[PDB]
Each structure stands twice: as C-alpha cells, then as structure tokens.
Amino acid sequence: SLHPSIPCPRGHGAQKAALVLLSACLVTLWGLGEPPEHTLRYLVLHLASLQLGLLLNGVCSLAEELRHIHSRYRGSYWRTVRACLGCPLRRGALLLLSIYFYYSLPPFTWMLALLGLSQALNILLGLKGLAPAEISAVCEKGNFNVAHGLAWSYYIGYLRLILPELQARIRTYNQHYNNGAVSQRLYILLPLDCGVPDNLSMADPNIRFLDKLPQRVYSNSIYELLENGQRAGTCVLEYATPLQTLFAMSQYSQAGFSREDRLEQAKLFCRTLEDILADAPESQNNCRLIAYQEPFSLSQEVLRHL
Amino acid sequence: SLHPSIPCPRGHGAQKAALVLLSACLVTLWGLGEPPEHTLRYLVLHLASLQLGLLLNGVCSLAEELRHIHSRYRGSYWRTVRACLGCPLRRGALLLLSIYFYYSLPNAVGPPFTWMLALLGLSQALNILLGLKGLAPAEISAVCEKGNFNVAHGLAWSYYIGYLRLILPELQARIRTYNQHYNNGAVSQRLYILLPLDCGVPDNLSMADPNIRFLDKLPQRVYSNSIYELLENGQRAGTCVLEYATPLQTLFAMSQYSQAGFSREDRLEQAKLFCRTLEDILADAPESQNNCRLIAYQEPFSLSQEVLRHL
Amino acid sequence: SLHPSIPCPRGHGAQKAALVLLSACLVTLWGLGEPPEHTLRYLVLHLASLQLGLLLNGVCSLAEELRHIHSRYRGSYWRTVRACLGCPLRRGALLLLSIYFYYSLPNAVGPPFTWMLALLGLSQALNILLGLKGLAPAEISAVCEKGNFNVAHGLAWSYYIGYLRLILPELQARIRTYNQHYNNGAVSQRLYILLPLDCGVPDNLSMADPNIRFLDKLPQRVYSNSIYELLENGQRAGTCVLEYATPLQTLFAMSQYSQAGFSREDRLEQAKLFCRTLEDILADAPESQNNCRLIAYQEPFSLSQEVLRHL
Amino acid sequence: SLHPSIPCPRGHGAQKAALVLLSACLVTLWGLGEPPEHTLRYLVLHLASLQLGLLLNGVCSLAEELRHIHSRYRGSYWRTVRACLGCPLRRGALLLLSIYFYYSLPPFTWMLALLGLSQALNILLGLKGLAPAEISAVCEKGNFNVAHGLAWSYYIGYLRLILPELQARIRTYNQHYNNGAVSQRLYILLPLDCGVPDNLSMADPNIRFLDKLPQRVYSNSIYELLENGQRAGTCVLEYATPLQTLFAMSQYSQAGFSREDRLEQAKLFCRTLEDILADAPESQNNCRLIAYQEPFSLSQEVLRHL
C-alpha cells in the first residue's frame, strides 16, 4: 500500500506450520504402533519437565527482577511473580500437577537434577536465547518500537494542530491570490533511508520552491512540481522531522541505534503514521504521505500523487 | 537518579541464580551417583532434544517469516534463516551433533530414535499451536530494554535532537541578550524542563500551582521559550525558564487514544524510561554541557518547591 | 573496493571450515564405530581440560594485569578478572562443571584427579613460559580489525573530523563563487583526495606527473586548496581540487622513525586500512554528500589517468 | 609520571607466574611418583595433541584466509600459511614429530577423530576466545592502537613544524612588546576525560586570553594565567586536538569506538606523545605537556608547571 518494502503485520504462519507438524507427528506415531499408555506417561512427564524448566527459568529471572520490585512493579511481589512466570494461577496449577505426576509416574530426583542442570546451563551460557524473528514478533505485537512513539508524538504534537487550520489558511491563500490553487492537503515526505536534505532543491532540481503558505505561524513550502520545465502542480510539502531524528540517532553512538534498526524503524514509522492518519478525526483527507526509497526522482512521485 | 521510581538498567541476577542452581544440582548429582556416562549420554541427547526443539520452533516460526522475506529481510533467504534460527553455523553444528548422536547413541530410559522425534514434534507443535512456548513479561521487558525497543527511547532522542539541540546553544546567547537589556533578578541560562511521571501536563503552568506565575517572554521557526518565576511566601525566591517536557504530554495522549494500543501501564513505564533516557542523553551531550536541568516529580507536595530547591 | 589490494572485511570461513571438519570427523567416527561410553566421557573430560587450561592461562595473564588495576582498569578488581579470564560467570560455571565432571567421572586412559592437576598445570606453565601458546599473525590481525585496534582507524577518523568535516560545508559555496567569477575555471564542487598506498607523499603535486600542473590557488585558522588541470596528450580534459591526504604522509614518517615501532609491512597494512576506513566514513557521513571523492593508487601508470577517469 | 592514571608498559608477570606454576607442578609430580616412561609418552602425546589442535585451528583459519591471499599477503601461499599456522618450519617439525609419536605410540585413529571434533567445536561455537587482557597485550605490544597513530601524526604534522620557529616568534614578540615575557615553550593540555571547551577562558575564569602570537601560517594564542584576578604567569596554551578527535570518535556511531575505548586511547595518546617528545630532536624543552583529569582547577595546575 504505502510502499512495497513496508512490512505488513505478521500472520499466523507459525500456527499453520505447527498444525502440519502435529498432523505429521500423529501420523508417524500411528506408523510406530507403540503402546500409548507409555506415550501418555512420557508426554505428561515431558510437559511436567518443561513446566519445571520454565519454572526454573522464571525463578532465575525473578532473582533479577526482585531488585526492580519497587521501580517497574510499584513494590508488589505478586506483580513481579506474574511478570517472571506468566499467569500465576495457570502456571501454579500446571506446576502442582507437574509435581504430582512427576512423583507418581516414574530414579525420581536424578531426572530433576539433570533437568535443572540443563536449564541453568541454558541461562548461563545463553542457550535459551531469542532469535531475531521472535524478538521482532514480540516487539511488533506489543508495540515496543521507537517508530510507534515517534509517529504518535508527531501526529499529536504537529499534525493535530495545523490540519484543522490548514484548509482555512489555503482558502485564504486562494482568495487573496489568483495565480494557482494549492490543495488543502499537507503533503508529507517519507524517505525510507531517513536522509532528508535541508531543502528540496538539493533533493531534486525539478521541484522548485514557489511561495510560502500564508499563516501561531507554520511555515509551508508550496513547490513548483515542474514536468519538463513547466508548472504541472502546486502542493504544500513539509518535511517529516521524525525520519530525520532516526538518522541522527543512527549517527550518535549513545543512542544504541544500528542502521538495520534505523531502516526498520523508518519502515514502521511510515506504517504506523499511515495507520494513525487513516482513522484520525482531524485528518479529513487533507493530509497525504509521500513515501519513497532510493533504488528515480522524487518529483515524479509527487506528480503521481497530484 | 532523576526519581526513586525510575528503573535502573538490568543486572545479571538471572546468571547468578543460574550459577547457584547449577552448583546445587551438581552437588545433588555427586550425592546420588547415578551412572555417570549414561548421565552424560542423556545430557547430550537432552541438549540435542532442546536444540531440536529450538530447530522445530524456528522451522514453524520460519513459516511466518518466509512470506515477509522481501520486505523485512531485503529478499535474502540466509537473512531470514538467521532471523528464525539464530546463527546458522553454530546452530547447524549443534544440530549435526544432535542428529549423529541420537542416531548412534542408545536410549535406555527414554524414547528410541523416531519415537523421540515424534513426541518432541508433538510437544513443540502443542507449544506453538496452543501458544505454550510464550514469553513472560519479564523476559519481554528485558529484551526490549536491551535492544532499545521502546517508544520512550525515540521520544527522548527526538525531543533532545529537535528542541534542546537547537535552542540550548542559542539559549545562553539569547538570555545574555535578555539580561544585557534588562536589570532585575537574572534568568539562569539553563533551560529547566519538568518531568511529571504521572504524565499530567496542564496547558498552563501558572495554573499548575499558584507559586509559579508567568513573568515575561524570551526575545529572540522561532523558539519563544516562556520564562517563569517562583513565589516563596509572596516573594520571588528564584526565576528560570520553566517549561514542560511535551513528550510526556504526547505519551498521555497516546494512552488516551484507543488506536495506539498503548495501555496505562505502558504509559507509566514509557514515561519513566523517557525520563531516564533524557537524563542519559543530556549527561554526555556536547551541546548541553551543564546547560539544562530536569525536574522529575510524581504527584501522589508542590511543583514550585522542588524547582525552588533545585535553584 | 577502492583498490584490488585493499583488504575486505574478514568473512566466516573459519566456522565454515570447522563445520566441514566436524561433519567429516563425525562421518569417520560412524565408520569406525568406537564405544560411545569412553568417547563422550573423554570428550567432556577434554573440554574440562581445555577450560582448566584457559583458567591457568588466565591466572598467569592476570598475574601481570593485577598490577595495572589502578590505572588501566580504574582500580576495580572485577573488571580485571573479567578482562583476564573472559566473562566471569560463564567461565566460572564452565569451570565448576569441569571440576565436578572430572573429579567424579572415571578415567581409564587418562590421569587421576591429582595427577591431572599436576600435569595440566605443568603443561600450561610450559605453554606460557616457552611462548608455546602463541598467536599466529592471522589471529592477531583478526582480533585487531574486529575491535578496531589500528592506527589507520584513528588516522582516518581524525582526518575526517578535523579537515574534511570543516572545509566541505564551505567548499561548495567557495567553488560556486569561483565558477561564477570565471567563465572560462570550471571546478567540480567535490574535494579530491589522493591515497597513494606506498605512502609516497612529495611536497609538490606537480612532481607526481607532468600532466598535473598547479593552475590557481582556490580562494578562501584559514583554509586553502589547489586546482590541478589534467593534460590528455597536452590538452586539458578536466580539473578539480586535488590535494594529498596528510595521514598517509604521517604513516610514512612513522615507518621512517625508529621510535614509532612501525615496520614497512605495518605501514602498508595500515595505509590500506586507512583507505578503507576513510572510504566508509565518507560514504556514511552527511557532510560528504557527494562533496568529496578519494583517489587510491599504488605505483607498480599515471595519476593523471586516474584523476581523469574520476572526472 | 605524566598522570597517576597513565598505565605503564606491560611487564613479564605472566612469565613469573608460569615459572611458579611449573615449579609447583614439577614438585607435585615428583611427590606422586608415577612411572616416567608412560608419563613421558603421555606428555609427548599431550603436547602433540595441543600441537595438533593448533594445526587444525590453523587449517580452519587458512581456509578463512585463503580468500584474502591476494590482498593481505601479496598473492603468495607461503606467507598465508605462515600467517595461519605459525612458523612453517618450526610448527612443521613439531607436527611431524607429533604425527610420528601418534602413529608409533597410540582405537588409534579414534583419538584423532575425537581431537578433530573437539577442535571443530572449539572454532565453531567459539570456545577458545581471547580474554580482554590478552587482546590488549597483543595490541599494545605490536602498536595496534588508535592513540599511537593519533599522537604520531599530531606530532609530525603540527609540533615538528611549529616548535622550531616557536622560540624565534616568541623572542620577536618579546622585543616587540614589553612588561610579561612568555616562555618559549608550547604548553599543550591533556584532559584525560577528552572534554575540551572551545575557549580556555570558558574552561576556567582564572585564565584569560591575552593576544595572538606573531606569525602556510600557524596562529597560536597566548593566555593570561591569572591568579586571584592578577597575572601570575604568561604562556601559550593550546588544546591537544587529538583528544577532541577522540571525543568526537566516541560520539559518532560508525566509529565503533566505545567510551571505554575512548578513555584507554586518551591515556595511550598522552603516554606515547610523552614518549615521542622525550626523544624528539625538534623538542628541546620547548614543549611541556599538562595532563589533568576532572575528579578541576586547570589554571592552578598550569601555574604549578610554571
């Protein structure tokens, strides 16, 4: 929609693949033709083992979180335990059932010792790490992105404050001038590579500054969208300042912001700004987003958007 | 050290607890004394089982990313596989170890070759389809804070870069211009920014507390940073440029809108993280070298008193 | 990719070769089919031995850094231990595993515990005293390039920060003025920098090749430049602001002096690395927005040909 | 001597610790009293195992470095092999002895396959890494530093060119002016924290700019070393701009320059600049370096150096 390289939200491919895997595995159990009582016993004991492993991982994480009880969790131990071990009730029931089915269904403590050894090794040596796909899925699902805050703050602080006045200001421009008539929209440029030139003339020569939109004060550059050197469109173009912030953050070392992160957060910023402006009451189709990526001329893109 | 309720970065408590647990488990193993080499074989086949579980979880998780290969991973399959299965070479070596060892090693207690594969696939497919292998919010927050995956990070860096980087270098000169032309007191050259942790941002700071009242405007895209003065028992005990950190107001507005997917708990956590990130940014900033102080407060007290004691 | 001889960043061929070797060795083990009992037992004992050898090497190397704690390591003992023995918790856990899994595991062909400790300490003490555990130059170069421990890195970054970042913002306007004044003269707005890999930097650029001749000193803590026309069979086909890169001259001066501890091979490697580092810095910088280009060469050919083909 | 936090060059403490370890281990071998023939066979095969491990590691690295044969090693196979496997002749003789002792003194090839597996796992997962202390020792022994290049270039390009004429220009200023006589030494300050203000007066009110030194051209400024508001010294003050460069490098993200690296390279730059100027023919007590760390009264320190 906005751009071919804007990442769409993640689907349920993992669930479908898990379904196919489950079907194949049940088919192959039917192939083995082994007694199912032992199958059920080992499966119950295996989920009990994994519940105890997640319990041990949660206790290890809770060891660290217990020092942050009064900062992130307002000094309540139950919120900390819920944070470190999922839902307390479901995990508590599953773990008590695990203990009972572990003591009942068969040594006894050696299996526990080896499982605890394996999980402590997982934590210490980092075996139980998270792949980049899992991290990205968790971050996007929970809206844990720089881009989300950037776009929401941008819309709330800037676009929400001039768009209600921009149509009236442009009507004032068209009544006080004859020339021609510029669209009521506030066209916004979204370069994916985050590199915004300080002026459109540097960005493109086929785009020429024409006039400053009439008036607090909010400067706006109507641009001569010249096609073959002739005036072919007039629209207000205003820089997307947050996309410059992403470049500045990737420049600074203190930001801890890589260039892969820079590109990804630029893409998510474009996507979430589009989503915000699609349903914003302030936006009444008087705000358009021009998103482009270097492989090309910006001028041709703006003409296509005119 | 802005406010006592601002969370300090993560420690290594998980690793310390894991070390203690591993020591205790080794003590228990030494005490019991099971077959040590079958213990080792079960441990190698068990790490093979965990690596195979990670392999199957990734393979199932690879299905959702393989369709995002062109956009999120610039159309290279190896990037996608590295994203879904960790480092390809290390994981491949561990999985080759797993395959060879489980095909060759016996399994006295436990499943044979194909039976372990079938039951582990059952367990992992249940983990994914039923969502059993999820992440507790502690690990989610740890990962987000380590990878800087927060809205507060962007809010703080954008606020600094777009406002303080552009007014503070000028603010010293501009207030010197203000103080050269006027005589009484003097406005301190540092821009004072308030950090209400509750994200409560009234439109007028004068109406925030009677002890703060508007004094004048700062003479020079123009940056009209309104100066303010503080009242102590009816007498001006100090004056400085007092303004609000507008990113906190934007965070409150984000939590208000239902399309933001932004809970009130997210609002509070990101407000605290924004305050901490702004402090860290201005600590090592080249332009803001002792040119800005941030007043952070959390209303359960007056705003004027804290700024007065910061004076 | 400025020059064919400029070293590209190191790949992952080491882990590729290790994976291929591991697969071949596992296939060979499957063919031979030794008992897995002593196989896995000895493998864990051997990795325990290697962890204990790294422990002994770290203790010996800490014996020299324990006296550098106040200055180099800001007087913190945990920093010194982490610097001498890797990550403290991971290595501590691995060593506890080693101690427990060697003390308890039997050893048919191998040492008992006390004779293990005796002979392993003997072996590592020999390794350190005789320098037997030495680092081949490939590992030295990989470590230095990975962590940016080079004079080339500092030279390139200082060059960019102190010279290119300070004249390029004004060189555009200055060359605009020079072009507008003279309608005859036509100078590209990009600074041109010469990178001779042999570090041969004479005082006069005209001595480099007869085609290059000093046309006019381009108009202006004041900066200056020079434009050199290029003679193609006696005719000028282009001109540009051509200046040497001083850091290569400083590199040659370093290799000349006996106090720098800088050999000719080091000079060549650092010159190439400086060329690559400056290329990357200028490519990713905002100031070098097509405002500068680098001419990298080594005399085995005329410089005029290269400057022309860039023009 | 330059500053209390400038690390002295590395010693031979590792050698002494290895000697103590060797003595104690030989003592305890003598105490245990084990057959010496099989002890020697095991130790020869053990050093042969370590040599074979280094051989396999060098084989893997050579597989890594063979693609850089035409860039780092001038297209010669022998230089690459010496780079990856140590000295070809010495390691070759040691490994030939290892091969003979393996074939003669031994499941014969099983030991070789297990050692190959262990080495492959060592390289793949990265078990045998290099500690920071070893990396620093290797780098500082071979002059693999940012600070080394920074200081040598700064000296060669600025001090070597202005110090010979500095005393003459100061003498000219002395005849031209009258009552204070500024010292003929160039005083360069070394802030270990790399925080350099734009002006000395801004850095400290106890120092005031006085005038410019008489004079491409080189413009240096004389600064008034005020004390209690009165002149107590007059000498040229000029920041060591390589420290400003180090701060900028730590600021930018593409530099790969951590703040710990920033401090380490600042310390090494000060130390190696001291070493360069101590034995420089162009330096004849006409340059005294002032090094300080903010825990600062720079003016008091400069007065102490007067």
Ligand SMILES: CCn1nc(C)cc1C(=O)Nc1nc2cc(C(N)=O)cc(OC)c2n1C/C=C/Cn1c(NC(=O)c2cc(C)nn2CC)nc2cc(C(N)=O)cc(OCCCN3CCOCC3)c21
């Ligand atoms: C990137 C900065 N930032 N990041 C976060 C997070 C918060 C802020 C921030 O707060 N910045 C800020 N605070 C100011 C205070 C004063 C003052 N007089 O005190 C003056 C300023 O500059 C004029 C101020 N600025 C900068 C200019 C800001 C708003 N603005 C923008 N949008 C953004 O900058 C932007 C980027 C992101 C991301 N999110 N936003 C929305 C805030 N485009 C503009 C174009 C014009 C023009 N062409 O004329 C004029 C603008 O300013 C009008 C604002 C007037 N004020 C004072 C009077 O009442 C109403 C508010 C424009």
Ligand SMILES: CCn1nc(C)cc1C(=O)Nc1nc2cc(C(N)=O)cc(OC)c2n1C/C=C/Cn1c(NC(=O)c2cc(C)nn2CC)nc2cc(C(N)=O)cc(OCCCN3CCOCC3)c21
């Ligand atoms: C940090 C920049 N850098 N990194 C590397 C690596 C090489 C250079 C570099 O030299 N860049 C450069 N090229 C220039 C050309 C002109 C011109 N008019 O053409 C003018 C410039 O600056 C005004 C020029 N500069 C700036 C810096 C210049 C030399 N210089 C320094 N030393 C350093 O900064 C420094 C730090 C480190 C580390 N290493 N070095 C030197 C190798 N101190 C100075 C104080 C004064 C003063 N108070 O008057 C005047 C100086 O230069 C005027 C005359 C210089 N001659 C030199 C020969 O060529 C013609 C100009 C000074």
Ligand SMILES: CC1(C)C(=O)N(Cc2c(F)cccc2Cl)c2cc(C(=O)NCc3c(F)cc(F)cc3F)ccc21
């Ligand atoms: C650490 C230790 C000793 C351990 O506690 N368990 C789990 C466990 C119990 F808690 C309790 C009883 C039995 C088991 Cl088996 C385990 C498993 C293996 C293994 O080989 N495979 C995993 C695996 C499968 F694929 C299928 C399956 F039905 C079961 C299963 F366990 C190796 C070592 C262990």
Ligand SMILES: CC1(C)C(=O)N(Cc2c(F)cccc2Cl)c2cc(C(=O)NCc3c(F)cc(F)cc3F)ccc21
């Ligand atoms: C991988 C494998 C099979 C192997 O190749 N070696 C080295 C080796 C030979 F190649 C060949 C013969 C003997 C040995 Cl010993 C080894 C050692 C152990 C061990 O138990 N201890 C280490 C250890 C010490 F503490 C002291 C010491 F003097 C020697 C020593 F090896 C376990 C497994 C192996």
